[PDB]
Amino acid sequence: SLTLFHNPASPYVRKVMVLLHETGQLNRVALQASQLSPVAPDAALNQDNPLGKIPALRLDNGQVLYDSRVILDYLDQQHVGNPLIPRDGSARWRRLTLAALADGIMDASVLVRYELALRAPEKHWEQWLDGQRDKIRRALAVLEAEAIAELASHFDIAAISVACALGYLDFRHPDLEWRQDHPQLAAWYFEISQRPSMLATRPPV
Amino acid sequence: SLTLFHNPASPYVRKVMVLLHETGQLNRVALQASQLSPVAPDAALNQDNPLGKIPALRLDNGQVLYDSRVILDYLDQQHVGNPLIPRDGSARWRRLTLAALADGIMDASVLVRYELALRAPEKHWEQWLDGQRDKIRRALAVLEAEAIAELASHFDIAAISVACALGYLDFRHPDLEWRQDHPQLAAWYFEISQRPSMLATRPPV
């Protein structure tokens, strides 16, 4: 069986859990709880993923896969249902780019979170935090203007990644209030939030 | 033709340039110079990649691909030579994980660089910088202990990414002196550095 380094707050981990849920592969995966930060290492995790990040997936043979996008690609090839990542065609690079946009939202939102929650407030850099927040808002603007129809057509790699990014914004950055300027995205997000895979993977209250 | 948002210092960009060089696709690509930082946006770049990061690749039809790993996957499917990313088999996820390890080295080394070069020294956080440096050293240790033979067997996605990560360490973090503790990696790195694709893509003096 597989072992996934796991935390119920992480949206990168959540992408993997949603994909396992959608593809019916949860029964293959043991979760290994992990609490960590860049300034608070998890030594057991570090022995499997030297970068000290989750998710990391340990295979039946002991080999370890990371990061999330590599794990997602692996798991999508493990089941015989319709692939959640297009194998070829323009759809492949379109959906993978949308997923990368979602990852970029998570990257920025995690950097802001670490800064505001772990770094001494006297050492905060406001132009930095604002720079990160700007990436998030530019990204959301694009999804709203260019991606609504594509996201709706299939709950795949792109939809899962965006959905998880949005959930993390609600969870750790509710001050952004992303729904105001992005109604179509918000409406879609409420709808997919009702999927069993999303309900089952919400971050802790 | 294609348009690549480009800077000769960026190792993520360098991965794309090395792959184009190796696969003979340089004649398809116009470079669009970009200078940027998280606190100094490039407005032309932002219109193509909302995350405000390079590389970003604009296709013949106007569509934009990012980030680097998506661009690398696209370009590797564009030529008819031997693929630099394994299409299946255990080799696919092994080589993609090694590439992700290299990306993790770049991620940490770029975060440190921004902190030390752009953030007011009174606001530096030493436990943070040290946390990032630790990921780099743990990653290098792993390449040295587990990956030498694999990297040597093919100058592919994994080798290109690692090679570019190491070049950036020499360029922006020469104080790490990674060669001391990692002789086999160092010897391999000197050898592949002599490839025309590497010579042609070195960061500026």
Ligand SMILES: N[C@@H](CCC(=O)N[C@@H](CS)C(=O)NCC(=O)O)C(=O)O
């Ligand atoms: N590129 C990685 C990013 C994963 C990531 O940053 N995970 C966070 C948890 S949400 C983490 O492990 N933080 C620990 C650290 O950065 O040291 C991926 O896609 O999996």
Ligand SMILES: N[C@@H](CCC(=O)N[C@@H](CS)C(=O)NCC(=O)O)C(=O)O
């Ligand atoms: N995940 C991205 C990371 C690219 C990246 O961070 N590029 C740096 C240049 S080396 C950058 O664009 N910095 C501008 C910024 O972070 O705002 C990729 O793999 O392409």
